[PDB]
């Protein structure tokens, strides 16, 4: 027909090897920018003054790092929450010093990943599917917004966002424990149950479907060729798996509806992970984990320590050592 | 950086040897 429509039909085409779509129009360039900046910085970025104290932290392979110690380093505390595009710097040299690649990378990524989510909806609509896969992905997405966006906001600086690195991630976890007692927070307890329980049910669902595969092969061939793709029928006896697992425990602790069984597998880790990301997002505003320090005392008033008091000694050692040259006054209020 | 110099040969063979094993087995499947 006309140009705009031939292009609109190419964009929303269900015959492209990779679906594009309108979300895909924003997604592709922003992931490409984030990915290219990240690969170049990880390898070659010079040191970055993360805490605003003129104490640059080296994160790149060419400056003495390996895969496990390297990272793209958060922008400086002197910036705090100010926007810092390249064009705001007097030179790439200044920008590199003050941590600009980190801001470039996380905005293009957060943006491109939010459109990933919409793309999952978009292609399900062109395919005639039910639409809620994207809802599941929102649990990891939301977790990423937490450590890269929400937590910096509440604490007033992208310098306290999660670093883009293996060791940098551990750094962020430890400082989080000292400053918020995340282990004592119920939302993170909900997150562990989230992912332990997910892996559990993952091993269980697989183990129980693999246990009930229908003999379709001989002992010399992979069982896997007993299934052919798009075949009309099922390749395991669910009645048989219910009979096994219903007896492992008792009959009604066992699912016999395929649909109920899979919705359960979707919902458990999604919700848990919603809670732990909700928990990072509310500790962004210093609503922290339970505090039972010196909560038990005797007739006279002596402190009878509990395990919570031992945790606080750990927390305290992280507290006093982190960012060792960055505090001039006795409280660490952000 | 004063790294361990057998690290190179250890990484190299750690990659090469099992990768050659898989390639040997894939190509001789494709030709039958």
């Amino acid at each position: 027909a006309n140009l705009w429509e031939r292009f609109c039909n190419w964009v929303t085409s269900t015959d492209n090897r990779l679906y594009v779509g309108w979300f895909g129009v924003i997604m592709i360039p922003t992931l490409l920018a984030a990915t290219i900046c990240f690969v170049i910085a990880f390898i070659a970025a010079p040191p970055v003054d993360i805490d605003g104290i003129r104490e640059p932290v080296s994160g790149s392979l060419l400056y003495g790092n390996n895969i496990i110690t390297g990272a793209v380093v958060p922008s400086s505390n002197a910036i705090g929450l100010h926007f810092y595009p390249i064009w705001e710097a007097a030179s790439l040299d200044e920008w590199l010093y003050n941590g600009g690649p980190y801001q470039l990378i996380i905005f293009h990524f957060l943006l491109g990943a939010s459109c990933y989510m919409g793309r999952q909806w978009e292609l399900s609509y062109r395919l005639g599917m039910r639409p809620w896969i994207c809802v599941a992905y929102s649990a990891p997405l939301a977790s990423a917004f937490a450590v890269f966006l929400i937590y910096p906001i509440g604490q007033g600086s992208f310098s306290d966002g999660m670093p883009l690195g293996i060791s940098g991630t551990f750094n962020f976890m430890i400082v989080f424990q000292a400053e918020h007692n995340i282990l004592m927070h119920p939302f993170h307890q909900l997150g562990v149950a989230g992912v332990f329980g997910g892996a559990l049910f993952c091993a269980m669902h697989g183990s129980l479907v693999t246990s009930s595969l229908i003999r379709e092969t001989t002992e010399t061939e992979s069982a896997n060729y007993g299934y052919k793709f798009g075949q009309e029928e099922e390749t395991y006896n669910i009645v048989a798996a219910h009979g096994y697992f219903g007896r492992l425990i008792f009959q009604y602790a066992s699912f016999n509806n395929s649909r109920s069984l899979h919705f359960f597998l979707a919902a458990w880790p999604v919700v848990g992970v919603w809670f732990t990301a909700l928990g990072i997002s509310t500790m962004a505003f210093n609503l922290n984990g339970f505090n039972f320090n010196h909560s038990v005392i005797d007739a006279k008033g002596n402190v009878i320590n509990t395990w919570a008091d031992i945790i606080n000694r750990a927390n305290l050692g992280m507290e006093v050592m982190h960012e060792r040259n960055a505090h001039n006054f006795p409280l660490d209020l952000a | 950086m004063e790294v361990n110099q057998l690290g190179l040969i250890a990484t190299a063979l750690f990659v090469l040897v099992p990768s050659v094993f898989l390639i040997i087995l894939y190509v001789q499947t494709e030709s039958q």
């Binding site: 090897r17 390898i43 392979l61 060419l62 390996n66 895969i67 052919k228 793709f229 798009g230 075949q231 | 950086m1 790294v3 690290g7 190179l8 990484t11 190299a12 990659v15």
Partner: peptide, 30 residues
């Protein structure tokens, strides 16, 4: 030398992505 090794392995993995997507066994419907 160590940087070169880390980057070479990373580069090979990106190459493997490319082939695994674009040169996959095409799934078909018996």
């Amino acid at each position: 030398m160590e940087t070169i090794t880390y980057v070479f392995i990373f580069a090979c993995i990106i190459a493997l992505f490319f082939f695994a997507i674009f040169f996959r066994e095409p799934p078909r419907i018996t």
